[PDB]
Amino acid sequence: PYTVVYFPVRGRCAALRMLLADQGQSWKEEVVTVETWQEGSLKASSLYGQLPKFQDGDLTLYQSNTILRHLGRTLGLYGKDQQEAALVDMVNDGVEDLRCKYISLIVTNYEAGKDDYVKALPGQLKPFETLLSQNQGGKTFIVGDQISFADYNLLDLLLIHEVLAPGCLDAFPLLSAYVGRLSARPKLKAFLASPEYVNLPINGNGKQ
Template sequence: MFQQVPMVEIDGMKMVQTRAILSYVAGKYNLYGKDLKERAMIDMYVEGTRDLMDVIRVHHKLSPKEKEKNLALIEEKATTRYLPVYEKVLDDHGQDFLVGNQLTWADIQLIEAILMAEEKVSTILSRFPLLQVFKARISNIPTIKKFLQPGSQRKPPPDEKLVSACRFQ
């Protein structure tokens, strides 16, 4: 539609735009809450998580000097702005998941953000015991566990070789 990727063919449709695709898949597979209120909460958490992921995603594009500053920024934003929010949500909600009592798109987005953050700062969860438990629990859901195994479809973090190759294309 906009001559860009991602584009997914699903249920006879060609869908574009990441959030539209993810919203559709979440709804199709019962990962988008039971009502409008839950969907609004899921959307809030997903958007906050995506903000954190945006800070992490730019890291591989930076010069070595900029990377050092960006690591400090990732750690600072994650540990003072984003992770405390999710720690409190889990504590206040008293459930195994961010919204309701079953896995949602928000949980999946958060586990990916946690994994991305840990790839940059391995101790990022050290001050967040509920998020440590959340990560372990969500990572052990059979389909997620399989996806996180080496050789799965989950892309590894970009290394210097990949970044260098992409710059010349």
């Protein structure tokens, strides 16, 4: 029984929402506003004093990747053996690092920094193209035969990079087909077109 407590923004919940939609799960969205947040109660009672906070039945979770690995573990989205498990984690950590650099740019330094960042970008996208080239021609998923929680996080990451810098995936045939093929999965396709996704901004400060 799933509840997502976050700001009215896609951000660090985009990926875990795509995961839930595509696994055909329901969930509730409890929305915290900037005004409510500044009141202090929820931040004070939260583990590390941030959001997302995620309820699953009796269990309360924080940290967006802790949620991904949790859903991935509980819904069978984590490779087939212990080695694919390691390789899933490798991809997701690599996604986390580029997502961090994306956030600092968006939040702290967008205007002066976008040019440098965009220059750097193909260098940062290369490894996921490489990894796809090494896993059955890139025709499948980022790791092994099956969908893993990393796929959802790398999909979100590519989507928001196509908005920040359109055409950045054009030099990368594998990543470029991948984004279209995953988006074409019918439970994701629907969600991705639903108002519950479409009607949120990507970040909180209006930049993208």
